[PDB]
Symmetry: D2
Subunit: 460 residues, 4 copies
């Protein structure tokens, strides 16, 4: 998912909408904005669909004010989602507060059961309602002290933005699992975003990361760090660099473009093969493939073309056209592929069902050989920190060998990025990253049965 | 507002939709349904607008199950409503529960402040969330005992339907302020509705009123009254008969058609005037006007015609046409009015602004005289029991005399229904009705500053 | 169908929209407007659905100008209509012209075949495209002379409004089959409409009928009758008074309210029966029923209530609820009907399927007897003049006797309005009306196989 | 624009929808389909917007049949388009016919004036209605002979597909200005499309080009060439290869991918400059830039990223952010640009306004130098053959020098593709291509004042 906050700008809702648009890749199932009116009321509008499908200019017009947070939401309920109320808003003894969260509370069920034992009710099963509940039972003042009280009980990943009647506060969990960054507009306006690309769009100059364990709060006085909670060696999600963030972004202080380009280079040195063309699975693996092509010394060619007009809800012929889902967004250039030995670069392999479709598509297009190259180590464990992966037995690198996956998807060779060379490339910062999906060893371990943060607002 | 519940029918969502349609007059600002899937999960879909604007056949298809409750909501936020989340659903230690409510908790702010003092948060400012909170902090079992526990702390009006993973329960407050009735379908299906007309549509035979102070619960065993909470002398809302319900309805055991027809008769005996025509303000006052015409001995004529295609949002010429809102739904028949002395019957006068528009419309249409007759006593005090009236100083009968209102709206005579003759017509049951809007004396008095239940899910 | 035209008003599109709304009863399948920009271009927007479903304030904004015509369209394709392009616009040697038509060209197929023989193509099968074709092959000048040339070849009914780059012209066929009336606004604005009620809404004072055979043209000079084409004794459609127009209207110089009230009176004198209540089928037959109740000396009671929220596309339970279409818009008042002998008044009986449903509905509501009274003579022949009736063998008065229809619909008695007493009530003007649907004798007879003017813009 | 036809498939409308989707780049302003029902009626549904915005599964369901043509339209009226009625359908003496056209009739106004002189009317100002008119006045039989008769009067570009009650015919004008290609499905189904990519999607194997001057007709007998009209030396649009078609396409027998890659190579040999990075303006110039990077020997990097979620209607901050239109779809990777000398490749320059925006965007992103390279010769003359270019004085290469454009857009160097080296690369086929937009010399010259085919169905 993705979060956004703006303090001190008369177009807070519009700028929040734009930054949510710039982060749309982080979550397509839902969107929402919460803005503080000049009379200090939290107006919220929230729906299922894309940021543009949820917000019209008519609706942005119903959100006047100087402060706003915004959330963009991923969900395996896909388009069959019934309700979405994130950013979550509530009222309690100290006023009104809304929160937008990106992450996953590992100890959600224990926290919820303990709160339920004293009569708490839950409108949604989302972590952010547990965060608000914890803040509410806190007896400390001011608001940031209650945020501190609440966060000390949370295990897991969280990057959050809170909005109140006159404050905007950003929180990054002590491990720093999830990206959060701060920028400033030409006027005093302060913005937080999940990635720097959202800052770039609305011309908020990137200033710094929000630090792991930090509680930044901006009000009339300005931006002030009012807590650097105790935090160990970091564990920032490596999958942000592998897959989840955009190449223009600078997440965790690194250029995502350079990460993926170097991954491609590593694949080419460490698992070369005679080939005539290097191509990508677009648009993800283009950058990595460029790097592979650079080291391998054979030219990159745009052998597959992503369609501009993909919809994700599309008609299919009655007489079966097999693999229509992919053929509706990937078109092969027969001129580039016919009779050639093709190295096709891609960013990962989880289920393995779509890689098979892509290999078949390339072969039907005239490819003589298809050598697959994955710009990531094999994914063996589930993510417990806020991005949905299937269960551990559904991960094809848990069931099958590398040679077995090679046979299953039907390609001549198959090579993953070596985990050890990844750590070598990171070098000094190799200790600053979570790799649980490649190793199986989690920095924060689940205390009982655990969940993916976003399902649906449908109640058991 | 209006509520509906169905237990024991494989088409629960569809039948709930139809009954909400049959109650659409009770509330046009929002609608919603909650249905229990075969796997015992509470699926809910809820939106702003009419029942047909909120529910498509596609969406009814996402609500399979045997149990469902439904709510249809009134709100002075009109079409500018941002969020509507009623019927309200939540999860707590004993499972999942949804509730639909019609009424008003007089002591909401005290109940909410006391709950806030122990760390409760509130997603909405609606009474029904307070009811769920109270149920949740109850330590009793079973569910109906917690309903009893919660209701003993509520002052005010409430007719509610609760749904859980396998039960449907109906609750009527001890004064019986608000209608609630029960009926049975051909199969075992049990339905509760705010008015009998919803029962009539979906062919659930009317069985009985839910009694004041009753907690009916239907499950696999059947319908069982499991509490008849202590209850004073009833105070059923007389405005259900004056204005709020449909003539086909039998609310509080009486035919609403007969109530309004007799009111018209009373107006004609007790305040006659020489006239040539008796007409109504449609479609509300047609029935009363018929009765007036009968007693007065001059013929009823349909002198105004309501338009079938009223939209409630509508374009207006830029060169202002005066009173375009009424002219867009009421068309006079000049043949019936030209040169005649007209007695025009209507159900009430609150603000008094539209009565003036209607008199002007009749005069422009050729009426020689316009004698206004209101099929209700003068409305002087605000309703504290779940249907929105303006504040007491905004009620024209608080500021002005009967003769003063006559002058302000511009008619030759003006007469209200005598309160004493209303009580005489009720006779034996004259003690069973709330009249606070005609007297000023409330059966349940507000403990502090008090609210109207509808609001908007926009947070202070 | 219904037509509208406005000349000389800067809000021509908005006023056209409003008048089309005021005529919405004439046709619900389509709508459209054509307005002349200040640069003398004919901007047109046209769609399937109601006037409000077709035109948004955003779309009215794309139609600036001083002149506009508008059409509202009936079609047996119902909501399954694929295209609608009426008002029809075209360009030809003398500029650009749009036309909106209400009526039916009896000799359409002959006219179209003769035009096809010289290479004409037809985008639609509508009469109005034939009218434009005929105007175009005319070699006369000015424009009204070409209209005259074209109309002399048309047999049948037509009330039309033409718009050009700077003129608005109204045409009524020599028999005057179809209503057309003219009014003036406060500024110079001149409007034509199918019924006076559309004039009344937008405050254009009714001036006069457009006369049978008249070609009125309004331009910068003003309104001028430039042709009173030869026309015989008129044959104005009696069904406008029986069914098609609104009671507020004055069609053909008569009050439709008085027509229907007198019809009710006639039914009561000429076919009385012992009864306890007189009721109507709402909203059509209320006026007639009032008159019946007046003569019969038993009180009218609103025994059925039309629903305000009828949709015409509505969900129905899977387990069969019989006659759900009617039960979804007509609700009986059991108090008015239980155990009583009911006379129910209605405006016609064509198919006879719905009268049976209504009788059954009344009986289920407790009626002891159901005496049906039809405020119209029996309909035996099809209309050849622009309002769709089923074929002659589908008309129940063609198959069955009066006593046979009585048995088929299941009522105790059944009585139609006597044709001879209808002619007596008309008196002097009894010669001025078409009665072909009651007699079978047509004033203008079809020259070959003939059509209903509106089908679909779907091509054979 | 783009055209599609399918004969002999029970899913003709669905397959037409998919092929129109695969051609969506050819025109975004409108879409439409015409399908022949089993009863031999031409059902058509047609609207403004994208293919997915125009067609729902509900609407495809209303188009059953075995034959269908489809059109996708470009229009400078953009989203402000009022009506789109293409594919055009009509009825005439020999039955019913629909046509979809891509091209431009140079002699439209003369053809239309001559047809107007004999009484023709025109619903639209589109060329395709003139084609239908000409077919209709033909006295020859069969249908293809009338097509031949009509085409002999047309000067200009046209690739058309006609549908009748039982035939599908394809027509390519004698110069072959516009692409049209034929393919076959697994069952007998025959499809025509503007580009091979539409064939590829729905698995119709590419068979051959439709030849310049050809009239192919497919019916029950099969595909038969029934006219190879006299045709000069071809003049196929070079802009199909420069800009208009997709790289997966094989238009005019050549791989568009190879054309653009070679153009990039030519730019690098003939106008080199010291640089550190080669980047493209996505996604258009990626292929050419790849070729440039190959010849120049400096690596390609994806220095700009096109946004996936471009909307073409989009909100903008009220405190103006400059160049928001481009910043909303192109994001620079600062890591790739900061301090580097950038060669940025793009496919053309017409107005020159957006190139300036892009250079500014690159400079703000840290580029030390910006060398622009255009993979096309300078565009000096307007296209008279069916794709909209501004007038000749609006083309920046008409006003300014190459060095002058370099200064105006603000880059260090600027180089266009040499026209002579383009002709050299074409070699044998250099005579088979229209270059009027680079030379000024037209193969077919306008006989009088001339138009762009798209317009809007708004009438003068
Ligand atoms: S388990 Fe994988 S996806 Fe989850 S935080 Fe760790 S590295 Fe990222
Ligand atoms: S105050 Fe009036 S409206 Fe309110 S419950 Fe009492 S009688 Fe009804
Ligand atoms: S046939 Fe009947 S409906 Fe038709 S014009 Fe004559 S009276 Fe009217
Ligand atoms: S003028 Fe240019 S764009 Fe037009 S057809 Fe010729 S080459 Fe193509």
């Amino acid at each position: 998912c993705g979060v956004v906050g703006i303090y001190g700008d008369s177009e807070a809702s519009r700028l929040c909408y734009l930054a949510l648009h710039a982060l749309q890749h982080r979550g397509q199932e839902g969107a929402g904005i919460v803005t503080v009116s000049k009379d200090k009321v939290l107006q919220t509008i929230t729906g299922v669909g894309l940021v543009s499908e949820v917000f019209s200019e008519s609706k942005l017009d119903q959100l006047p004010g100087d402060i706003a947070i915004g959330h963009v939401r991923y969900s395996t309920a896909g388009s069959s989602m019934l309700k979405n109320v994130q950013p979550f808003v509530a009222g309690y003894r100290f006023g009104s507060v809304g929160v937008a969260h990106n992450g996953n509370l590992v100890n959600y069920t224990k926290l919820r059961a303990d709160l339920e034992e004293n009569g708490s009710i839950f409108n949604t099963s989302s972590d952010t309602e547990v965060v608000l509940h914890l803040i509410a039972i806190s007896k400390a003042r001011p608001f940031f002290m209650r945020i501190v009280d609440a966060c000390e009980k949370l295990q897991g990943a969280y990057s959050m933005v809170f909005v109140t009647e006159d404050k905007l506060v950003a929180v990054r969990d002590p491990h720093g699992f999830r990206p959060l960054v701060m920028g400033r507009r030409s006027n005093g306006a302060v913005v937080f975003a999940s990635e720097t690309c959202a800052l770039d769009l609305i011309e908020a100059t990137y200033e710094r990361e929000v630090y792991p364990g930090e509680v930044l709060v901006v009000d009339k006085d300005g931006v002030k760090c009012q807590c650097l909670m105790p935090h160990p060696e970091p564990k920032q999600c490596i999958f942000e660099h592998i897959y989840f963030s955009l190449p223009n972004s600078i997440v965790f202080g690194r250029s995502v473009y350079e990460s993926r380009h170097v991954f491609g280079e590593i694949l080419a040195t460490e698992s070369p093969v005679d080939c005539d063309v290097v191509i990508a699975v677009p648009d993800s693996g283009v950058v990595a493939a460029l790097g592979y092509a650079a080291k391998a010394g054979v030219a990159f060619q745009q052998g597959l073309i992503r369609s501009h007009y993909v919809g994700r809800t599309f008609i299919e012929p009655s007489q079966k056209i097999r693999d229509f889902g992919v053929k509706l967004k990937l078109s092969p250039v027969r001129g580039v592929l016919e009779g050639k030995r093709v190295v096709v670069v891609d960013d990962s392999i989880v289920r393995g069902t779509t890689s098979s479709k892509i290999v078949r598509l390339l072969r039907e297009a005239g490819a003589k050989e298809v050598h697959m190259r994955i710009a990531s180590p094999p994914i063996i464990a589930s993510c417990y920190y806020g991005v949905d992966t299937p269960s551990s037995n559904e991960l094809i690198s848990n069931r099958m060998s590398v040679d077995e996956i090679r046979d299953y998807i039907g390609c001549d060779s198959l090579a993953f990025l070596s985990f050890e060379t990844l750590k070598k490339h990171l070098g000094e910062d190799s200790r600053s990253f979570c790799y649980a999906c490649f190793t199986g060893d989690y920095p924060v371990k689940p205390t009982e049965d655990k969940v993916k943060r976003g399902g649906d607002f449908i109640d058991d």
